[PDB]
């Protein structure tokens, strides 16, 4: 399913009495971060965070920089307005977060657009899947809904998600060819950990995989094992790949009767692993 996505994540945080809100943006293609912007930088500008976006010329970077500087001001106004809708004091710090982008299929056409917001960590307002209407979380957000409706904001948004987002993504997939189209299958191995007694932990590792989506199960004959398993959150290795492990205690005298099953895009076939001393 050579399907793909682009997302921008915005965070604006107010700082009353210490000037304007901070505005931070990051952009992703799939699970690869490719740009950032931070308004607190000495010279705020969009910057490259993946090797394949550096090939864009200086006009690309300046245009995006202008967009984010304008967005920062927009989000400041929004933060001022929201403080008022919730009757909140002027001294406190608050957070407006935005997320938007597009999902496309192997043909490169829009499958789903997104554009939604959270205020102080909770859903505020979201553009619905029809890209023509909104869902408001509470009566404060209905105030914003009425402004967004009045101004037909959903039309400009739709224009972006249908008419710009998908075309830029196509372009980034061409710039990044190899790194974005190729999945990196996990390097895998099981270790033995004796809870120095009459039972031990087997921990099944998966290292160096991209994209992040992976499934690690322990299971008997098609039938699951979880008397006690610890399964850690997938975590970034820091070189654009990810890591994960799952663990289980079995009656380890010699109950190496339990197996580890790994599924991942970069694996032609699901794999099955076992301890090897």
């Amino acid at each position: 399913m050579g399907s793909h996505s682009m997302r921008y994540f915005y965070t604006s945080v107010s700082r009353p009495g210490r000037g304007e809100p901070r505005f931070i943006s990051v952009g992703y293609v799939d699970d690869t971060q490719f740009v950032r912007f931070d308004s607190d930088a000495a010279s705020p500008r969009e910057e490259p965070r993946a090797p394949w976006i550096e090939q864009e010329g200086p006009e690309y970077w300046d245009r995006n920089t202008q967009i984010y500087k304008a967005q920062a001001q927009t989000d400041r106004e929004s933060l001022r307005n929201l403080r008022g809708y919730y009757n909140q004091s002027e001294a406190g710090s608050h957070t407006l977060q935005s997320m938007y982008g597009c999902d496309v299929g192997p043909d490169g056409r829009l499958l789903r657009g997104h554009n939604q917001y959270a205020y102080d960590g909770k859903d505020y307002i979201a553009l619905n899947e029809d890209l023509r209407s909104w869902t408001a979380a509470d009566t404060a957000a209905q105030i914003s809904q009425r402004k967004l409706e009045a101004a037909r904001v959903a039309e400009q948004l739709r224009a972006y998600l249908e008419g710009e987002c998908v075309e830029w993504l196509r372009r980034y997939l061409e710039n990044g060819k190899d790194k974005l189209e190729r999945a990196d299958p996990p390097k895998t191995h099981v270790t033995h950990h004796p809870i120095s007694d009459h039972e031990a932990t087997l921990r099944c590792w998966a290292l160096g995989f991209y994209p992040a989506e992976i499934t690690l199960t322990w299971q008997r004959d098609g039938e699951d094992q979880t008397q006690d398993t610890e399964l850690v959150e997938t975590r970034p290795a820091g070189d654009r790949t990810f890591q994960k492990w799952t663990a289980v205690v079995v009656p380890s005298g010699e109950e190496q009767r339990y197996t580890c099953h790994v599924q991942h895009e970069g694996l032609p076939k699901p794999l099955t692993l076992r301890w090897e001393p």
Partner: peptide, 9 residues
Amino acid sequence: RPQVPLRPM
């Protein structure tokens, strides 16, 4: 490329 800003909330 990011979208140009919308009207404020």
